[PDB]
From Swiss-Prot:
Family: Belongs to the TRIM/RBCC family.
Residue numbers of the full-length protein present here: 104 to 143 of 518
UniProt tissue specificity: Ubiquitous; highly expressed in brain, heart, kidney, liver, skeletal muscle, spleen and testis.
PTM note: Autoubiquitinated.
Name of the protein: E3 ubiquitin-protein ligase TRIM39
Zn-finger region bounds: B box-type: 8-47
């Protein structure tokens, strides 16, 4: 089909499993970004929920 493995995305720069999400920028980020100059002092929040796991 159109998609192959619909599991998780990957940063367009780090290509890492995107699980985090910045608040200010209002966009998705990765483990790296979180601890990067770009979103260093930014409010990053996890995109996980107590529902699934
Ligand atoms: Zn990243
Ligand atoms: Zn940010």
């Amino acid at each position: 089909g159109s998609s192959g493995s619909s599991g998780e995305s990957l940063c367009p720069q780090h290509h890492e499993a995107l699980s985090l999400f910045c608040y200010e920028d209002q966009e998705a980020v990765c483990l790296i970004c979180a601890i990067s100059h770009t979103h260093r002092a930014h409010t990053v929040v996890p995109l996980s929920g107590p529902s699934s796991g």
